[PDB]
Design a protein around this nucleic acid. Structure first.
Ligand code: SF4
Ligand SMILES: [Ca+2]
Ligand SMILES: [Ca+2]
Ligand SMILES: [Ca+2]
Length: 350
DNA sequence: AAGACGTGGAC
DNA sequence: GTCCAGTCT
């Protein structure tokens, strides 16, 4: 494999075409690490405003570590896959507590941190510290599957390990961070899933898939399974003084530690009744439902139905619930589904 | 291994 | 509608 003629060419292309993204302003390990977590299964264009806002709020690792969990989650509100930021928050706290605020440059110690998998180890340490670890994301797997005509299913962990070995074989130990970011940028800008720009492509000469005319069929990936449908009844409960009842989800599993309007997973069966029974347990009367809408997750679809109701206080509002004046709802981090619940509630109200 | 785990944007 | 931008369990 003509590594040098591939490398020199990839990196020259990158020097010319590299996007001036916010996290490329410097090689600060904290800012890099934040961006690499935010970018997990999230497009660059989506990340940009979140990254800018997050770094303004949490300018250093210490700032992030010292912040309240609710503040950090609100900074992630709407980005999706919220355990990323809970893991990052813990990883920074551990980096502060254990390492005094210096991001480990040891791969095993960096990898020991929550949220830091093989991609994030390679991305951060190669960029920040020059450590020659591979940084294999979807872009890289697309590029390598085409270059070396690798047909193994990339859903398999073992496939990713094969790509990691290829990177180690063709890397540029001279400039590891720049090699890694260049391979990713190639997949971002050129070696795209549909209609890849093979003719423009710098490393076209080395592409087995190009020769064979099969780039549009790679990488190989098993079609996704159809997802579960889940009915969800949601109560929007306001008292005479405009405050609304919300509750914090447990830290285990779906939308962990986010706030929501109280909801009961129904089986499509007696929703309004299930909601009234749910609140009584942990005084309230619900009207007819005002809207029904769906909300997609990667692995299930919520079918939401919103029931207005009136709240009469008969005791202390006990955890996990909170009585929030309308003007303070904006302080809490809500999943997009419940942001829409509230929007629909307000539209109906008017 | 393979399901859990969000969301928006482009086909 | 499908596809697509990592890590924990
Ligand atoms: S020639 Fe086409 S398929 Fe091959 S690396 Fe370039 S863009 Fe991807
Ligand atoms: Ca790890
Ligand atoms: Ca890509
Ligand atoms: Ca739970």
């Amino acid at each position: 494999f003509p590594a040098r003629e591939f490398q020199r060419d990839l990196l020259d292309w990158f020097a010319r075409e590299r996007r001036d993204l916010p996290w490329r302003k410097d090689r600060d390990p904290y800012k890099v690490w934040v961006s690499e977590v935010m970018l997990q299964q999230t497009r660059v264009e989506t990340v940009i405003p979140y990254f800018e806002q997050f770094i303004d709020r949490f300018p250093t690792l210490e700032a992030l570590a010292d912040a309240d969990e609710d503040e950090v989650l609100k900074a992630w509100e709407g980005l999706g896959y919220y355990s990323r930021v809970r893991n990052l928050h813990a990883a920074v706290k551990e980096v502060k507590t254990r390492y005094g605020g210096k991001v480990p440059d040891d791969p095993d110690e960096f990898s020991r941190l929550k949220g830091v998998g093989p991609y994030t180890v390679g991305a951060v340490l190669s960029l920040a510290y020059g450590v020659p670890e591979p940084a294999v994301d979807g872009n890289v797997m697309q590029v390598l599957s085409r270059l070396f005509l690798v047909t193994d299913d990339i859903a398999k962990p073992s496939t990713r390990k094969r790509f990691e070995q290829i990177v180690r074989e063709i890397m540029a130990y001279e400039n590891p961070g720049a090699f890694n970011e260049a391979l990713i940028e190639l997949g971002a800008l050129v070696c795209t899933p549909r209609r890849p720009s093979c003719l423009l492509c710098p490393v076209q000469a080395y592409c087995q898939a190009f020769a064979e005319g099969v780039a549009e069929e790679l990488p190989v990936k098993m079609k996704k399974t159809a997802v579960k449908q889940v009915p969800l009844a949601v109560a929007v409960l306001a008292d005479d003084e405009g405050r609304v009842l919300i509750r914090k989800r447990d830290s285990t599993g779906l939308l962990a530690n986010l706030w929501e309007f109280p909801s009961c997973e129904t089986d499509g069966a007696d929703g309004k009744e299930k909601l009234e029974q749910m609140v009584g347990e942990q005084q309230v009367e619900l009207t007819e439902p005002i809207v029904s809408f769906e909300h997609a997750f990667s692995h299930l679809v919520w079918q939401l139905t919103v029931f207005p109701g009136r709240l009469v206080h008969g005791g202390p509002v006990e955890e996990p619930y909170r009585l929030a004046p309308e003007d303070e709802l904006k302080a809490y981090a809500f999943p997009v589904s419940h942001q829409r619940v509230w929007r629909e509630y307000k539209e109906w109200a008017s």
